[PDB]
């Protein structure tokens, strides 16, 4: 229930241990006034400093003037910080405004068309994003709601996604969670302690060509539907072939323990792990940080389940793109469909109480 | 922590309120009474396992490689998490299997209420399973696996995820707040109040339907909140809507949340004043609802609200008179009922040989 520090060379919410709940919001900008937008970013940073510490925004949730609306909507009163992190990102479309064209990073790459793509343009894209992660879903909702409220007239929410439970891990010493296909998800990720690997694979460096992005990262988001009726009638052997690990322990095929190193030649040629492994993609490595979702029924008598997939990397062109290209033949494709997509440049961290979100860009 | 599955009553009504909810309504697709009773028996066997933290059937792995596993496996390595599984039967169930003359009179169709905007597709249902637990993945796994066991005899008509408090970080005697920022639950029937449960919640044999003795009647209302409008209202308007202050949740003119209200100090159309038993001939409800937030609609607005759940001994003397009295509720400016359903919740599963619905079938 403790707080995660807000300041740092990097934004929290990436290498931070993965909290239980997600409320992810993408926003479109509705003002042409660069000065107005910069003022918003500063006001948003001030609110985030309050929210991540478990304090109400502005002058609080009650006790102000009776005839004025409260500054904070109040549904997080009496709750602890609950490990809330708030991570902001800038979408490619944003750089068509405020004269930012020349500052769009090369590594903020548009994604190519992938086979099987069925992307809903409504729940895709976005000028910017805010990833709210916490162990308490009310805490995460309260933060998005109050950010949106502060931004009224300058931003609007384009689409949002809640994740009811994590399917990722940055802490290999704790239990690996399972996704809705029933397999452990997150075993061979990057841990928040592996500072060497985070530098090599996640954080943008000054030499990469975009100086204002040093210390930031790049985010790929893909909403993925799961064909659970199809999956749930497949044999256990079929499910285990699809991934290359057994369902119970999550060990690589042939081995006894979850964390034993995979032996790729023992897996089928189209097994998910075999195709996704760094060694199959010239060393390309990802920080996976996704969450499970369910949004009611599908209107055809079934539950609607999926995986909201999030990956951070140092360069989209050397992370998500090569790996996802290698998944064209993935056995898993038979049970999933990508139905939403967006990319964001995640700026560096807020260094101290004088700093603000996006200050290196603006 | 686990909650015993067997008892004179079904669990999940008077038992401690868990952190999360997965509520599902099912429609029946078979006409065969025997096949349906068979399913009820299979569901009961599975619920015994699920509520103890065990996988269904012969497990989620380690069986024949050529067969699908009995359990879909996403709850492996998790704890029982106080899972309760509560089943109810909708009025439309009794048009099947020759049950028409066994529908309880207390399972009454709801009138149309002013301002209703009910989405047919998120209303009704032949039966429901209320799954409550502290871990949402435990609740979802339960619904997902019951549906799979029932595939071919029942379909999922609609489904609602909910959250209340998070127990790891919040004390138990602290009242949760709803998404309007007000404490919700202050004056409610508690599960410790055996006498009030008997008077207001549990069906008695003399009530008129013997197979429902020990059961209860459930009203579900999916209530959307107009969040963005509410958040523009002044602090005074918000407190005037309810008749309590927002910070402490004390009735107007009082000092503590649990001070008994003085109804005459509240505005004539304040929510607490219209909902109070003294304003409804003594009618009292057990509220057990959950907040929801499903995402955002096509106009950028938050799709959130209160999934209202009320248990009562007779719908005609519980939910209906109180809701009728809210016709002029000042809260009506800010909410909209968009889904509704009623269910008869049968008595408990007495022992290892009993099953869901045995008193009706
Ligand atoms: C619903 C969609 C998906 C499911 C259910 C899924 C499932 C899994 C599972 C069960 C594992 C094995 C345990 C581990 O995390 O190490 C895994 C590994 C992995 N997955 Fe996925 N995955 C999905 C989508 C994706 C996508 C879209 C990508 C990349 C574009 C990806 C990249 C990876 C990588 C890099 C690994 C680690 C392989 C290794 O280095 O050993 N996954 N995934
Ligand atoms: C979005 C919808 C609703 C909200 C936000 C809401 C909120 C509240 C709040 C804040 C209280 C005061 C604290 C408490 O004693 O629990 C309360 C009391 C109460 N509400 Fe509501 N309510 C809603 C809908 C309903 C409905 C539909 C009913 C019944 C049909 C209802 C019946 C009651 C009752 C019986 C009380 C107890 C009054 C007393 O004995 O003091 N509420 N509600």
């Amino acid at each position: 229930g403790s707080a995660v520090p807000f300041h740092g060379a990097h934004q929290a919410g990436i290498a931070t241990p993965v909290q239980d709940r997600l409320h992810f919001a993408a926003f479109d900008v509705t003002t042409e006034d660069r000065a107005a937008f910069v003022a918003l970013l500063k006001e948003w940073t001030a609110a985030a400093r309050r929210l991540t510490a478990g304090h109400a925004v502005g002058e609080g949730a009650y006790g102000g003037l009776p005839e004025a609306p409260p500054d904070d909507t109040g549904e997080a009163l009496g709750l602890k910080p609950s490990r809330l992190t708030l991570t902001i990102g800038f979408g490619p479309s944003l750089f068509t405004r405020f004269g930012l064209a020349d500052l769009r990073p090369e590594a903020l790459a548009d994604l190519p068309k992938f086979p099987g793509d069925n992307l809903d343009r409504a729940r895709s894209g976005g000028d910017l994003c805010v990833q709210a992660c916490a162990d308490d879903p009310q805490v995460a909702v309260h933060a998005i709601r109050n950010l949106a409220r502060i931004g009224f007239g300058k931003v609007v929410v384009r689409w949002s996604q809640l994740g009811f439970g994590k399917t990722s891990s940055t802490t290999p010493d704790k239990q690996t969670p399972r996704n809705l296909l029933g397999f452990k998800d997150g075993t061979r990720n990057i841990a928040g302690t592996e500072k060497d690997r985070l530098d090599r694979f996640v954080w943008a460096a000054e030499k990469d060509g975009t100086p204002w992005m040093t210390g930031g990262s790049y985010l790929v988001a893909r909403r993925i539907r799961m064909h659970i009726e199809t999956w749930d009638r497949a044999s256990l052997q079929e499910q285990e072939d699809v991934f290359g690990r057994d369902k119970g322990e999550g060990a690589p095929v042939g081995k006894a323990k979850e964390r034993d190193e995979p032996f790729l030649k023992a897996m089928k040629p189209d097994a998910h792990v075999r195709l996704a492994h760094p060694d199959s993609n010239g060393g390309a490595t990802l920080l996976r940080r996704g969450y499970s979702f369910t949004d009611g029924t599908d209107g055809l008598g079934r539950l609607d389940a999926g995986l909201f997939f999030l990956a951070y990397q140092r360069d989209i062109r050397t992370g998500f793109v090569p790996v996802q290209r290698n998944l064209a033949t993935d056995a898993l494709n038979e049970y999933i469909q990508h139905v939403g997509s967006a990319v964001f440049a995640v700026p560096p961290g807020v260094r101290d109480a004088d700093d603000w979100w996006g200050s290196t860009l603006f």
Side-chain angles (χ1 to χ4, degrees), chain A:
Chain A
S2 54
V4 175
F6 181 73
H7 296 141
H10 311 288
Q11 294 195 62
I14 307 165
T16 305
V18 178
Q19 308 94 320
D20 286 339
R21 309 282 308 219
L22 167 84
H23 191 154
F24 190 108
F27 294 79
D28 285 340
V29 178
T30 61
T31 169
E32 312 278 35
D33 180 355
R34 159 199 271 251
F37 187 72
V38 162
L40 167 57
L41 287 176
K42 289 171 173 181
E43 210 172 343
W44 267 13
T45 307
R49 279 189 196 104
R50 298 298 277 179
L51 292 166
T52 52
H55 307 305
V57 313
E59 314 238 23
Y62 62 94
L65 301 170
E67 72 264 3
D71 276 348
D72 186 294
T73 55
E75 74 269 24
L77 267 176
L79 304 186
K80 290 143 155 106
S82 320
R83 293 202 298 166
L84 173 68
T85 54
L86 291 178
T87 308
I88 191 172
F90 300 139
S93 54
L94 179 73
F95 297 87
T96 65
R97 298 172 168 262
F98 319 125
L100 308 154
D102 297 327
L103 290 158
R104 166 189 191 154
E106 278 295 277
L108 184 50
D110 288 301
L111 299 172
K113 321 80 209 183
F114 295 102
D117 268 354
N118 184 33
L119 308 178
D120 180 357
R121 189 199 239 169
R123 329 266 309 286
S124 302
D127 281 337
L128 56 79
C129 68
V130 167
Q131 170 195 277
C133 287
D135 291 328
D136 187 331
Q138 194 142 326
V139 168
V141 165
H142 171 267
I144 300 299
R145 168 181 186 181
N146 276 269
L147 287 177
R149 186 162 171 257
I150 294 182
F152 181 82
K154 314 192 190 174
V155 287
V156 310
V157 178
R158 174 181 184 91
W159 58 267
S160 70
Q161 180 71 63
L162 287 84
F164 70 80
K166 64 192 178 174
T167 54
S168 50
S169 168
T170 59
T171 54
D173 51 289
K174 291 156 47 215
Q175 191 181 40
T176 307
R178 298 188 185 253
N179 55 48
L180 289 175
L181 307 180
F183 281 73
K184 294 174 176 176
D185 207 334
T187 306
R188 283 189 23 87
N189 206 31
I190 299 159
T193 60
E194 290 168 333
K195 313 286 220 42
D196 271 43
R197 300 184 80 212
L198 290 164
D199 292 329
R200 180 171 235 196
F201 294 121
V202 171
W203 299 130
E206 170 164 44
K207 306 332 281 162
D208 294 358
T210 299
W212 74 268
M213 267 298 300
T214 312
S217 185
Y218 298 91
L219 173 60
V220 179
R222 313 272 295 194
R223 199 173 180 263
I224 307 172
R225 179 160 298 122
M226 294 166 150
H227 304 317
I228 52 156
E229 161 170 8
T230 317
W231 177 256
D232 277 358
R233 78 172 168 261
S235 72
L236 180 71
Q237 185 74 273
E238 273 163 326
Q239 298 186 359
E240 291 185 340
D241 281 345
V242 158
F243 284 112
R245 297 177 176 268
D246 76 272
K247 204 167 180 170
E249 173 72 19
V253 67
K255 291 199 164 176
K257 295 291 158 175
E258 178 195 346
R259 305 214 157 263
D260 293 342
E261 280 296 356
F263 187 72
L264 301 181
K265 282 64 41 184
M267 316 181 171
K268 298 291 191 62
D270 57 354
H272 181 71
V273 170
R274 185 174 188 170
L275 294 171
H277 196 274
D279 287 0
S280 312
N281 300 269
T285 306
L286 303 179
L287 202 154
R288 286 171 296 137
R289 216 174 184 283
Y291 284 78
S292 297
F293 72 84
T294 176
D295 294 348
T297 52
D298 63 3
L300 305 148
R302 304 171 308 179
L303 291 177
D304 171 275
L307 189 138
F308 187 63
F309 180 91
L310 302 163
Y312 292 87
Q313 59 269 281
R314 185 174 164 179
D315 190 338
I316 295 176
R317 298 165 310 172
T318 64
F320 177 81
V321 167
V323 182
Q324 173 67 27
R325 283 202 217 261
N326 217 44
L327 294 192
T329 62
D330 194 350
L332 183 57
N333 288 340
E334 182 66 37
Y335 307 94
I336 61 161
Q337 188 178 46
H338 294 235
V339 298
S341 175
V343 292
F344 307 91
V346 173
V350 184
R351 314 300 321 250
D352 51 45
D354 262 296
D355 202 0
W356 42 283
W357 271 341
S359 63
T360 68
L361 177 70
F362 298 89

Short mmCIF file of all heavy atoms in Angstrom, two decimals, chain A residues 42 100 106 109 123 142 148 160 185 192 238 259 262 274 294-295 305 335 356 358:
data_model
loop_
_atom_site.label_atom_id
_atom_site.label_comp_id
_atom_site.label_asym_id
_atom_site.label_seq_id
_atom_site.Cartn_x
_atom_site.Cartn_y
_atom_site.Cartn_z
N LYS A 42 2.07 21.43 -16.76
CA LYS A 42 2.52 21.79 -15.42
C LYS A 42 1.44 21.49 -14.38
O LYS A 42 1.72 20.93 -13.32
CB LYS A 42 2.92 23.27 -15.37
CG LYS A 42 4.22 23.57 -16.11
CD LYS A 42 4.51 25.06 -16.26
CE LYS A 42 5.90 25.30 -16.85
NZ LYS A 42 6.24 26.74 -16.99
N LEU A 100 6.08 21.20 -33.56
CA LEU A 100 6.95 20.16 -33.04
C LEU A 100 7.40 19.18 -34.12
O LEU A 100 8.00 18.15 -33.79
CB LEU A 100 6.24 19.40 -31.92
CG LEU A 100 5.67 20.28 -30.81
CD1 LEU A 100 4.50 19.57 -30.13
CD2 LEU A 100 6.74 20.66 -29.80
N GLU A 106 12.99 9.67 -34.49
CA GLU A 106 13.01 8.60 -35.49
C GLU A 106 12.50 7.29 -34.88
O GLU A 106 11.74 6.55 -35.52
CB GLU A 106 14.42 8.41 -36.04
CG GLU A 106 14.80 9.38 -37.13
CD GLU A 106 13.97 9.21 -38.40
OE1 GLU A 106 14.30 8.33 -39.23
OE2 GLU A 106 12.99 9.96 -38.56
N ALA A 109 8.32 5.14 -34.41
CA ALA A 109 8.04 4.62 -35.74
C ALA A 109 6.57 4.26 -35.87
O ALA A 109 5.98 3.68 -34.96
CB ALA A 109 8.91 3.40 -36.02
N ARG A 123 -10.55 2.90 -31.19
CA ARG A 123 -9.75 2.56 -30.01
C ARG A 123 -8.27 2.41 -30.37
O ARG A 123 -7.57 1.56 -29.82
CB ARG A 123 -10.26 1.29 -29.33
CG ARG A 123 -11.75 1.03 -29.45
CD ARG A 123 -12.55 1.57 -28.25
NE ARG A 123 -12.01 1.15 -26.95
CZ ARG A 123 -12.12 -0.08 -26.43
NH1 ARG A 123 -12.74 -1.05 -27.09
NH2 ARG A 123 -11.60 -0.33 -25.23
N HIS A 142 -9.74 7.20 -10.04
CA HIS A 142 -9.78 8.56 -9.50
C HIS A 142 -8.72 9.44 -10.17
O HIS A 142 -8.97 10.62 -10.45
CB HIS A 142 -9.59 8.51 -7.98
CG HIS A 142 -9.40 9.85 -7.32
ND1 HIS A 142 -8.15 10.40 -7.09
CD2 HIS A 142 -10.30 10.73 -6.83
CE1 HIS A 142 -8.30 11.58 -6.50
NE2 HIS A 142 -9.59 11.80 -6.33
N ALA A 148 -8.39 14.03 -16.42
CA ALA A 148 -9.32 14.44 -17.47
C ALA A 148 -10.07 15.71 -17.09
O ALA A 148 -10.27 16.60 -17.92
CB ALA A 148 -10.32 13.31 -17.78
N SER A 160 -10.25 4.49 -23.76
CA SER A 160 -9.60 4.07 -22.53
C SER A 160 -9.72 2.56 -22.41
O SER A 160 -10.52 1.92 -23.11
CB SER A 160 -10.19 4.78 -21.29
OG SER A 160 -11.51 4.34 -21.02
N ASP A 185 2.73 -15.80 -17.59
CA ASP A 185 3.09 -14.78 -18.57
C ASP A 185 4.02 -13.79 -17.89
O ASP A 185 3.59 -13.05 -17.01
CB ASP A 185 1.82 -14.07 -19.08
CG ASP A 185 1.95 -13.50 -20.50
OD1 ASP A 185 3.07 -13.18 -20.98
OD2 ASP A 185 0.87 -13.36 -21.13
N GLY A 192 13.31 -5.19 -12.99
CA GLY A 192 13.62 -3.81 -12.63
C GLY A 192 14.98 -3.63 -11.98
O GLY A 192 15.46 -2.50 -11.88
N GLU A 238 -2.19 -29.72 -27.35
CA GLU A 238 -2.23 -28.63 -28.32
C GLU A 238 -1.86 -27.29 -27.68
O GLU A 238 -1.09 -26.50 -28.25
CB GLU A 238 -3.61 -28.55 -28.96
CG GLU A 238 -3.78 -29.46 -30.19
CD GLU A 238 -5.24 -29.70 -30.59
OE1 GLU A 238 -6.13 -29.77 -29.70
OE2 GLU A 238 -5.50 -29.82 -31.81
N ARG A 259 11.85 -21.52 -14.47
CA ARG A 259 12.95 -20.63 -14.82
C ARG A 259 14.16 -21.34 -15.43
O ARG A 259 15.17 -20.68 -15.69
CB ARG A 259 13.39 -19.83 -13.60
CG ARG A 259 12.26 -19.06 -12.95
CD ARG A 259 12.70 -17.73 -12.36
NE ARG A 259 11.56 -16.82 -12.26
CZ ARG A 259 11.27 -15.88 -13.15
NH1 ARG A 259 12.05 -15.71 -14.22
NH2 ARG A 259 10.20 -15.10 -12.98
N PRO A 262 15.05 -22.05 -21.74
CA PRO A 262 14.46 -22.83 -22.84
C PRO A 262 15.53 -23.40 -23.76
O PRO A 262 16.58 -22.79 -23.98
CB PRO A 262 13.57 -21.82 -23.58
CG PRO A 262 13.94 -20.48 -23.03
CD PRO A 262 14.56 -20.67 -21.69
N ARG A 274 9.56 -19.98 -29.03
CA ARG A 274 10.65 -20.14 -29.98
C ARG A 274 10.76 -18.93 -30.90
O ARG A 274 11.85 -18.40 -31.10
CB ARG A 274 10.45 -21.42 -30.79
CG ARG A 274 11.61 -21.70 -31.72
CD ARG A 274 11.46 -23.05 -32.40
NE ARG A 274 12.67 -23.36 -33.14
CZ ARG A 274 12.94 -24.55 -33.69
NH1 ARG A 274 12.07 -25.54 -33.58
NH2 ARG A 274 14.07 -24.72 -34.35
N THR A 294 -11.62 -8.03 -19.57
CA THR A 294 -12.87 -8.57 -20.10
C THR A 294 -13.89 -7.45 -20.14
O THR A 294 -14.03 -6.69 -19.18
CB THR A 294 -13.40 -9.73 -19.27
OG1 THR A 294 -14.67 -10.12 -19.81
CG2 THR A 294 -13.59 -9.33 -17.80
N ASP A 295 -14.59 -7.34 -21.26
CA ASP A 295 -15.57 -6.29 -21.49
C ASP A 295 -16.92 -6.94 -21.79
O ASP A 295 -17.41 -6.90 -22.92
CB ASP A 295 -15.13 -5.36 -22.66
CG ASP A 295 -13.87 -4.56 -22.33
OD1 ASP A 295 -13.45 -4.54 -21.15
OD2 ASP A 295 -13.28 -3.96 -23.26
N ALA A 305 -13.04 -11.81 -23.64
CA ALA A 305 -11.79 -11.71 -22.91
C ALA A 305 -10.65 -11.34 -23.85
O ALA A 305 -10.70 -11.62 -25.05
CB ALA A 305 -11.44 -13.03 -22.22
N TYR A 335 -5.60 -18.24 -32.21
CA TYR A 335 -6.45 -18.01 -31.06
C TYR A 335 -6.53 -16.55 -30.64
O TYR A 335 -7.15 -16.24 -29.61
CB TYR A 335 -5.96 -18.86 -29.89
CG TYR A 335 -5.82 -20.33 -30.21
CD1 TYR A 335 -4.60 -20.87 -30.62
CD2 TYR A 335 -6.90 -21.19 -30.09
CE1 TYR A 335 -4.48 -22.23 -30.91
CE2 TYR A 335 -6.79 -22.53 -30.38
CZ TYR A 335 -5.59 -23.05 -30.79
OH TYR A 335 -5.50 -24.40 -31.07
N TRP A 356 8.72 19.37 -14.84
CA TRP A 356 7.35 19.08 -15.26
C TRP A 356 7.37 18.16 -16.48
O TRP A 356 8.36 18.09 -17.21
CB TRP A 356 6.56 20.36 -15.54
CG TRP A 356 7.32 21.39 -16.28
CD1 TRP A 356 8.29 22.22 -15.78
CD2 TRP A 356 7.20 21.71 -17.67
NE1 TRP A 356 8.78 23.03 -16.78
CE2 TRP A 356 8.12 22.74 -17.95
CE3 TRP A 356 6.38 21.22 -18.70
CZ2 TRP A 356 8.25 23.29 -19.22
CZ3 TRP A 356 6.52 21.76 -19.96
CH2 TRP A 356 7.45 22.79 -20.21
N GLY A 358 7.26 16.64 -19.90
CA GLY A 358 7.50 17.16 -21.23
C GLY A 358 8.40 18.37 -21.28
O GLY A 358 8.54 18.96 -22.36
#
